[PDB]
Amino acid sequence: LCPFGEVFNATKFPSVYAWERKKISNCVADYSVLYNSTFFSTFKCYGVSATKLNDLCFSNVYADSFVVKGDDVRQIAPGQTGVIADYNYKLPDDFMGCVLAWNTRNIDATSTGNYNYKYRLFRKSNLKPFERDISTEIYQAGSTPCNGVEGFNCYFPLQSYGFQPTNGVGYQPYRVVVLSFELLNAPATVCGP
Amino acid sequence: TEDLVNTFLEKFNYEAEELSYQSSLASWNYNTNITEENVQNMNNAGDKWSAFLKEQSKLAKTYPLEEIQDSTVKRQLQALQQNGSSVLSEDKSKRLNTILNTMSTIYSTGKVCNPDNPQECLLLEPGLNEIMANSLDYNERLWAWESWRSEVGKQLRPLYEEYVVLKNEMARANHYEDYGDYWRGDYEVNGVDGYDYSRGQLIEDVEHTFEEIKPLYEHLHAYVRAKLMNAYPSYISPIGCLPAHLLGDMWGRFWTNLYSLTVPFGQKPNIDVTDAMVDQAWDAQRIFKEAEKFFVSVGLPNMTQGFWENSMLTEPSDSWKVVCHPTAWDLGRGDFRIKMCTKVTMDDFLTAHHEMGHIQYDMAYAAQPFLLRNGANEGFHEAVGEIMSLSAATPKHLKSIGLLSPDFQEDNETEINFLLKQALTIVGTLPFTYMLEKWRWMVFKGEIPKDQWMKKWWEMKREIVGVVEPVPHDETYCDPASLFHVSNDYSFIRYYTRTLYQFQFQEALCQAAKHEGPLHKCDISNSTEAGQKLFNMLRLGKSEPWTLALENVVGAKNMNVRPLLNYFEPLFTWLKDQNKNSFVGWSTDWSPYA
Numbered sequence: 123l124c125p126f127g128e129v130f131n132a133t134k135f136p137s138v139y140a141w142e143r144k145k146i147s148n149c150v151a152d153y154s155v156l157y158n159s160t161f162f163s164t165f166k167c168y169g170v171s172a173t174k175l176n177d178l179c180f181s182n183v184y185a186d187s188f189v190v191k192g193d194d195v196r197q198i199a200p201g202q203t204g205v206i207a208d209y210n211y212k213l214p215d216d217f218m219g220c221v222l223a224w225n226t227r228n229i230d231a232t233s234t235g236n237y238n239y240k241y242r243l244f245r246k247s248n249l250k251p252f253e254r255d256i257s258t259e260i261y262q263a264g265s266t267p268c269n270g271v272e273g274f275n276c277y278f279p280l281q282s283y284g285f286q287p288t289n290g291v292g293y294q295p296y297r298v299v300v301l302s303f304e305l306l307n308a309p310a311t312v313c314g315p
Numbered sequence: 316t317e318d319l320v321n322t323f324l325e326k327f328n329y330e331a332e333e334l335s336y337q338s339s340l341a342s343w344n345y346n347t348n349i350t351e352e353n354v355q356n357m358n359n360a361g362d363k364w365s366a367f368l369k370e371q372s373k374l375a376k377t378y379p380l381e382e383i384q385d386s387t388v389k390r391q392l393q394a395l396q397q398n399g400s401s402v403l404s405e406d407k408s409k410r411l412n413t414i415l416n417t418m419s420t421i422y423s424t425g426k427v428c429n430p431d432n433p434q435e436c437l438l439l440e441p442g443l444n445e446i447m448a449n450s451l452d453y454n455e456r457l458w459a460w461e462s463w464r465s466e467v468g469k470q471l472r473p474l475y476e477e478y479v480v481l482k483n484e485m486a487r488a489n490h491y492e493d494y495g496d497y498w499r500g501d502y503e504v505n506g507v508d509g510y511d512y513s514r515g516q517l518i519e520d521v522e523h524t525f526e527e528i529k530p531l532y533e534h535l536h537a538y539v540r541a542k543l544m545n546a547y548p549s550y551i552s553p554i555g556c557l558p559a560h561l562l563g564d565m566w567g568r569f570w571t572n573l574y575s576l577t578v579p580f581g582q583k584p585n586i587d588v589t590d591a592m593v594d595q596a597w598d599a600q601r602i603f604k605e606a607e608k609f610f611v612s613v614g615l616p617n618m619t620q621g622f623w624e625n626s627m628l629t630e631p632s633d634s635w636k637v638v639c640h641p642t643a644w645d646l647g648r649g650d651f652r653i654k655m656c657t658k659v660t661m662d663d664f665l666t667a668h669h670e671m672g673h674i675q676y677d678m679a680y681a682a683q684p685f686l687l688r689n690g691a692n693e694g695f696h697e698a699v700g701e702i703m704s705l706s707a708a709t710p711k712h713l714k715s716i717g718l719l720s721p722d723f724q725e726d727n728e729t730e731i732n733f734l735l736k737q738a739l740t741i742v743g744t745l746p747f748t749y750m751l752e753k754w755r756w757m758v759f760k761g762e763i764p765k766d767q768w769m770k771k772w773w774e775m776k777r778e779i780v781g782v783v784e785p786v787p788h789d790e791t792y793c794d795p796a797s798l799f800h801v802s803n804d805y806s807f808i809r810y811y812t813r814t815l816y817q818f819q820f821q822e823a824l825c826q827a828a829k830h831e832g833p834l835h836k837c838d839i840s841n842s843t844e845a846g847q848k849l850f851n852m853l854r855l856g857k858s859e860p861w862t863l864a865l866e867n868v869v870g871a872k873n874m875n876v877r878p879l880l881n882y883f884e885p886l887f888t889w890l891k892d893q894n895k896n897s898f899v900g901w902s903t904d905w906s907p908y909a
């Protein structure tokens with residue numbers, strides 16, 4: 123009953139800097155579609171067991187979608203300090219969910235080069251857990267002002283991935299879905315039969 | 316200010332990934348398809364990546380190098396700053412690039428015609444190289460040798476004169492002594508206490524290590540000369556130098572082709588079972604999968620999927636042009652392939668381990684930042700690849716693979732035959748390499764007047780290499796430019812340094828593998844301990860200085876001749892006994908002419 127296919131089998135996936143969020147509640151979750159599949163290449167559940175979660179009840183599930191290269195997938199975990207985990211998507215140290223990812227070279231990589239997927243390279247401070255930043259203001263690393271124009275020590279914050287089919291596995295596009303589980307004061311709204 | 320360089324390099328590292336991978340992908344299509352369509356696309360992407368390095372290097376110099384504390388960060392900015400040699404006139408650099416292109420075209424298109432039959436006009440490869448490597452006629456070899464230096468050699472004389480002037484002007488503007496001091500900077504380590512190295516220390520160490528090679532080379536020279544007197548009777552003196560056109564190639568850079576004339580024990584069969592090993596066809600995938608298992612047994616990773624999907628492992632159809640030089644490609648972004656025109660032979664099977672050694676090096680230092688993805692110095696890559704074919708050529712490995720007969724007879728005579736073949740290639744090129752760079756170093760330093768170029772060139776050939784010109788050459792010739800590396804603007808001392816490095820590596824890896832017998836019989840297969848010691852050097856890249864990366868494997872901060880001399884010690888004692896009734900050394904006054 124839960125719209126899981128609308129998140130996993132979704133056509134367009136967002137950039138990691140502008141990751142999307144879907145709030146799911148009041149349905150019958152069938153997590154067997156996920157862990158009984160060679161489709162997923164990672165599937166690391168932090169805080170819960172990847173198998174025991176099927177007979178467990180929660181309050182709501184937050185499915186976060188984005189795209190990162192293969193070498194950037196290891197940053198989608200509690201306690202990481204890369205570029206994706208610092209300026210794009212930081213998971214909390216007390217994260218209670220599962221991180222699923224799979225290779226999408228045939229879908230997200232073109233021979234001419236897929237430059238659509240972008241990520242934030244520079245930011246003043248780091249990102250608090252589950253924070254989002256869509257600002258395209260010219261990052262200023264030095265003292266001299268940057269106005270709106272680029273130039274000396276004035277850099278555009280967003281950089282774009284280059285997804286060609288000849289890239290190595292570490293540089294191939296992977297679609298990540300971060301299932302975030304939580305329980306408020308009401309603990310039962312979505313559960314497995 | 317130290318944080319400013321961090322944000323600057325963090326944009327350089329990611330914008331370089333874009334332009335370097337696009338220029339590398341376009342460069343691959345030309346080498347897999349020679350067509351003006353691809354030649355222009357390759358050059359365009361390369362021009363973008365070049366213009367990028369122009370601006371980024373100027374911007375990199377604006378940041379002070381000494382105001383940085385982080386060693387790894389300081390090393391990154393330095394490489395970018397040192398890449399800025401843009402101190403010349405737009406017109407004079409345009410002429411220098413015209414000179415460099417003219418010499419390259421003359422060398423690659425130079426043709427000589429047989430005076431007896433003008434129908435046969437031969438360029439260098441193939442033709443003149445086939446004469447210098449197979450012909451046993453003194454006059455025929457003398458013709459090809461003299462023609463290449465009297466025709467195309469003289470054309471390069473005026474170009475090389477202006478080539479020196481413009482190159483020295485460019486170098487001196489970058490606080491360099493000369494263009495020779497420029498090339499020598501690849502070994503310079505300014506900073507890190509205890510691991511430094513100067514642009515002049517290389518000259519001292521190269522000459523020091525070469526002094527210990529003189530005894531081994533003198534006896535190889537004496538043995539070769541005696542054998543060559545039987546091949547070319549009445550043309551060679553038992554006490555004089557060897558004529559240049561009798562050395563196996565156009566220049567004498569390698570004595571490999573002299574093995575048929577200098578084989579110690581010719582009655583024993585040759586281990587190059589290429590003919591019968593062709594019958595064991597297997598496939599091209601089996602050849603490289605065997606190379607894969609070699610590195611896997613030592614503890615190194617398997618080849619990437621891109622290697623089996625995007626690489627040239629054979630020769631597809633006929634409607635597709637392909638360049639045949641063996642090359643390993645590290646295009647970036649995890650893209651690793653090898654392009655090499657290989658059949659089901661055996662000499663390429665050794666080169667297959669060589670080129671795959673380059674890939675293992677490229678794979679290991681991929682974790683380093685962009686500016687630090689290179690060998691420790693220019694000689695580190697070739698030394699890494701050479702030890703692979705060095706281990707994969709031993710009879711023990713060939714027995715265990717199923718290629719050689721399980722009951723091969725390893726006499727002490729078949730050991731000399733193999734080592735002698737190695738010495739003609741490995742040791743014969745050391746005096747040629749050092750003497751060539753010694754001449755170019757002194758020319759750039761202004762120590763050789765223009766009216767004494769060929770006089771000093773051949774004075775050093777007779778003294779250092781022990782090779783005399785067959786016919787006298789005045790200052791109209793330019794025999795150095797008759798070699799590819801000289802006329803195409805490439806440093807040449809790398810072939811000397813890597814040759815000493817590769818035996819230091821092999822000695823270190825075989826001691827880590829606890830090899831028992833002689834060093835030339837060592838095979839580091841199945842030795843995870845030897846791979847861990849080697850891997851600790853491959854992963855460094857150009858991050859740590861070359862002295863430290865060398866120390867991580869061999870345990871020394873400089874070159875070492877002892878591993879090279881110990882490799883050829885079974886042959887060295889045999890040569891000393893063979894020359895007891897000969898004359899070791901040569902008179903620098905005897906010449907084939909009068």
Ligand SMILES: *[C@@H]1O[C@H](CO[C@@H]2O[C@@H](C)[C@@H](O)[C@@H](O)[C@@H]2O)[C@@H](O[C@@H]2O[C@H](CO)[C@@H](O[C@@H]3O[C@H](CO)[C@@H](O[C@@H]4O[C@H](CO)[C@@H](O)[C@H](O)[C@@H]4O)[C@H](O)[C@@H]3O)[C@H](O)[C@H]2NC(C)=O)[C@H](O)[C@H]1NC(C)=O
Nearest residue numbers: 365394397398642643644645673677685686687688689696
């Ligand atoms: C200024 O920099 C440019 C670009 O170098 C970049 O910056 C440095 C700091 C490093 O991070 C580099 O990785 C980066 O690209 C220099 O121009 C290029 O220089 C490289 C090498 O320095 C040339 O590429 C290769 O050069 C190899 C030298 O050994 C050649 O050897 C091959 O190795 C492969 C291994 O895969 C094997 O198949 C073989 O053994 C083979 O011998 C190889 O042929 C290849 O050419 C490249 O061609 C250069 N390109 C251009 C456009 O210049 C530049 O030299 C430098 N200038 C300075 C320092 O003055």
Ligand SMILES: *[C@@H]1O[C@H](CO)[C@@H](O[C@@H]2O[C@H](CO)[C@@H](O[C@@H]3O[C@H](CO)[C@@H](O)[C@H](O)[C@@H]3O)[C@H](O)[C@H]2NC(C)=O)[C@H](O)[C@H]1NC(C)=O
Nearest residue numbers: 125126127128129130131132152154155156158159160161
């Ligand atoms: C995304 O699309 C894939 C297909 O490309 C979906 O996979 C399919 O999922 C259904 C269940 O939703 C599977 O049906 C079940 O199959 C089992 C046998 O495995 C059968 O016993 C059940 O009765 C039921 O029919 C189906 O087999 C499976 N097929 C494939 C090819 O994967 C997936 O559910 C979609 N949604 C996601 C991934 O969220």
Ligand SMILES: *[C@@H]1O[C@H](CO)[C@@H](O[C@@H]2O[C@H](CO)[C@@H](O)[C@H](O)[C@H]2NC(C)=O)[C@H](O)[C@H]1NC(C)=O
Nearest residue numbers: 612711712713714715716717721838840841842
């Ligand atoms: C060590 O290397 C040798 C080859 O160099 C391996 O021995 C061969 O292994 C294959 C299959 O594993 C057999 O078909 C061959 O017959 C073996 N060679 C010989 C001569 O018998 C060996 O597996 C490697 N590892 C160890 C632990 O010895």
Ligand SMILES: *[C@@H]1O[C@H](CO[C@@H]2O[C@@H](C)[C@@H](O)[C@@H](O)[C@@H]2O)[C@@H](O)[C@H](O)[C@H]1NC(C)=O
Nearest residue numbers: 344346347348350352353627631635636637
């Ligand atoms: C060579 O090119 C093949 C087809 O590519 C197209 O045709 C060639 C002639 C070029 O014009 C190229 O720019 C075109 O895109 C490829 O199928 C093949 O893999 C390439 N390499 C080899 C070794 O054949």
Ligand SMILES: *[C@@H]1O[C@H](CO)[C@@H](O)[C@H](O)[C@H]1NC(C)=O
Nearest residue numbers: 607611615616617618619620
């Ligand atoms: C190499 O191949 C072996 C055998 O298939 C495999 O067990 C190992 O994981 C591979 N290593 C890689 C792909 O790095």
Ligand SMILES: [Cl-]
Nearest residue numbers: 559566794795
């Ligand atoms: Cl010469």
Ligand SMILES: [Zn+2]
Nearest residue numbers: 669670673700
């Ligand atoms: Zn090589």
